[PDB]
Ligand binder design. Sequence first.
Ligand SMILES: Cc1ccc(C(=O)Nc2ccc(CN3CCN(C)CC3)c(C(F)(F)F)c2)cc1C#Cc1cnc2cccnn12
Ligand SMILES: Cc1ccc(C(=O)Nc2ccc(CN3CCN(C)CC3)c(C(F)(F)F)c2)cc1C#Cc1cnc2cccnn12
Ligand SMILES: [N+]
Ligand SMILES: [N+]
Lengths: 264, 264
Amino acid sequence: KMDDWEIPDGQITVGQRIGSGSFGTVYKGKWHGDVAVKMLNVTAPTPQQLQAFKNEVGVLRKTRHVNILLFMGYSTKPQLAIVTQWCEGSSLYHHLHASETKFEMKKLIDIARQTARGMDYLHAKSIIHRDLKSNNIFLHEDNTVKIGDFGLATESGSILWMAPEVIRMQDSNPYSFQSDVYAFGIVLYELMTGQLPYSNINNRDQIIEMVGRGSLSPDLSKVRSNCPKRMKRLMAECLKKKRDERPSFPRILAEIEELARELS
Amino acid sequence: KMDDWEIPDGQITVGQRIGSGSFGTVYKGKWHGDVAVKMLNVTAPTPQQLQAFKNEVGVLRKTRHVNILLFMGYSTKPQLAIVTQWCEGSSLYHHLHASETKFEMKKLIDIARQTARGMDYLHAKSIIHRDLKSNNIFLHEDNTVKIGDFGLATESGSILWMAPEVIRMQDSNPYSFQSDVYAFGIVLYELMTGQLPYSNINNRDQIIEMVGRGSLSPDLSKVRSNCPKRMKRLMAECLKKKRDERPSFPRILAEIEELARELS
Ligand SMILES: Cc1ccc(C(=O)Nc2ccc(CN3CCN(C)CC3)c(C(F)(F)F)c2)cc1C#Cc1cnc2cccnn12
Ligand SMILES: Cc1ccc(C(=O)Nc2ccc(CN3CCN(C)CC3)c(C(F)(F)F)c2)cc1C#Cc1cnc2cccnn12
Ligand SMILES: [N+]
Ligand SMILES: [N+]
């Protein structure tokens, strides 16, 4: 039952504020070591806010994997809050797009590989991320990928990871395993090029229209010269405009693991 | 309910055998990346073996902390098995007592600190380890302590970590939070001296008798010259012959965290 992960009031020490976001405000904290606490920052949660809290706790409780941010518990007083492990360092987004760090290809592949492990796990439990993007991939201790859904803005933007069908939305719910695969394709692009797609287009509404219609797609000729050819091909497959031509994660993971195994 | 963490048959790939032990046989495996699988290696589990399996799953399910080995799931077919994350490297025992590695003091303190985090967490949930010893402290990636209860023999032996009251056993069940604190004291000794206590005594039965009676205790004059004085004092307190003079983990952890914070 849910109360097994309830942390009684008074035990958590809230420290430095990290950021407010779409899912609450995040702090560093102490509770049997370092933790992160995401607070619903709100005077009277409505029943919808309560349901959403419950939903996040419910899904996080189903995850036990080294590449999924570790859920540790929740509290309902002093306020609504979710507690996770504390990750040191910063996001993949931060490393690629807003830092002097340039990773070696082995490391780039290892990041890809870990990210694929996490996603394969989530898909195996029928969990659809919907917000996979480099800013939701934390490089804990610069080494271990932790996927989360942090809701913190970068230093929609996020429309860069959306599959064509997600942008078009001609049915109610266009999200799927295959849409997460597309987003993962865009993370691969980021890794293998160092860049965000469509850097030479300055109108987010044209990017939206054009990706939706199939007239614009990421320029794969930009991948670095030492990107393995099978990586570039997998990326192309993850980015297929037609949802059902994209591969599934078990195959994605196996093929990346094969690339990583060869580079010693 | 328990079945939420059941992994269906066929999904796990069992690889290299690691060791048989007191709690089953351990293999490296693949399941959405690397895992360890501990197999009950047995043709017809008795009801006691089944209960013990359930007990291990039940306790491991209550743990979500970065310094407790991550439980991931179990199977009941092909055989009884528990699945955890795969730890790279080796045990603390291995590093201190059977390797060329000599750690710096900062690192030794950080190991102490992480181990204290894990133990404080387990005690906060009323979990008594009973087998805390350096061979049950894994240094994952040489950096992150993962406490488990692996049951694998080293390259009782384990009587070295037993508090006097545990050896004497004048009541049925001499185990407690305070007995885990003593064992942690002996891990501190290992860290700060590089050695097992009582290396100049070759009769395990005399060590047993004498620790039980209070006539023999670890020689703390052996700690390395750069061991902080407050560390040496905490170790002395964790090793108190009288159970109730030993500190609790919240205090143990706070004082180690204070030592670690000062060394930058
Ligand atoms: C305190 C906290 C609480 C919660 C979460 C959080 O990630 N929530 C989460 C919600 C849902 C899902 C899965 N769903 C996605 C939606 N989808 C519709 C359904 C499936 C997942 C996922 F991991 F499974 F992806 C995570 C993160 C933080 C953090 C933190 C933290 C830790 N270190 C640092 C360092 C700097 C900054 N922050 N930080
Ligand atoms: C597959 C597997 C399954 C289970 C366990 C296991 O640790 N079980 C466990 C049972 C009980 C308890 C707590 N109780 C102690 C008793 N006490 C009476 C009650 C409280 C805990 C603890 F972590 F909480 F301590 C752990 C470990 C392995 C492993 C592995 C593995 C992973 N990487 C490697 C690399 C090399 C070798 N092995 N390996
Ligand atoms: N990082
Ligand atoms: N290690």
